[PDB]
Design a protein around this nucleic acid. Structure first.
Ligand SMILES: [Zn+2]
Ligand SMILES: [Zn+2]
Ligand SMILES: [Zn+2]
Ligand SMILES: [Zn+2]
Ligand SMILES: [Zn+2]
Length: 142
DNA sequence: ACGCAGGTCCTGGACGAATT
DNA sequence: TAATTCGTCCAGGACCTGCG
């Protein structure tokens, strides 16, 4: 049960050359499941079917509390915690709690003080790109 | 004013689970 | 069993919003 074929990208082992060639598609994209609309590629056909809803607008996960629908069950699961006031994610530095996992991760970056987004017009630095994009709209109004 | 930051939800890669 | 397909988590955003 040895394995002699290795991937020069991630280092995973395979017992047959054909097994290595099939796995190597995740690094080059060749022969991956390709969307017929935008021609983007994904890891397997199930991830492709999830992406298909981005073109059709289908939201098959509806909240039974307010009636709003979502594209993914994970998004619905996160949304339901809003109705119940469930905030399991907390910042270990200041104690601020969030129901959204990304809101907590985004908040914790503020304790580092890093502002890697600098305005190309005036040089004002921002910790988030979306706030810089909104700031540049003020510049757009000449 | 408008920078700041939390609210909200869409998007997709990661990865074990379930199916074929 | 091996390969494919699926479910799920989770990271990374974009758009919206009100506060100081
Ligand atoms: Zn590899
Ligand atoms: Zn597509
Ligand atoms: Zn709801
Ligand atoms: Zn904090
Ligand atoms: Zn500027």
């Amino acid at each position: 049960g040895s394995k002699s074929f290795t991937c020069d990208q991630c280092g995973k082992y395979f017992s047959q050359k054909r097994q290595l060639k099939s796995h190597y598609r995740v690094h080059t994209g060749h022969s991956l499941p390709e969307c017929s609309h935008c021609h983007r590629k994904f890891m397997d056909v199930s991830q492709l079917k999830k992406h298909l809803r981005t073109h059709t607008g289908e939201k098959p996960f509806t909240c039974e509390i307010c009636g709003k629908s979502f594209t993914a069950k994970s998004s619905l699961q996160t949304h339901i915690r809003i109705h119940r006031g469930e905030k399991p994610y907390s910042c270990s530095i200041c104690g601020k709690c969030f129901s959204d996992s990304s809101a907590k991760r985004r908040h914790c970056i503020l304790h580092t003080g890093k502002k890697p987004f600098s305005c190309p017009e005036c040089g004002l630095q921002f910790a988030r790109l979306d706030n810089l994009k909104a700031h540049l709209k003020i510049h757009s109004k000449e």
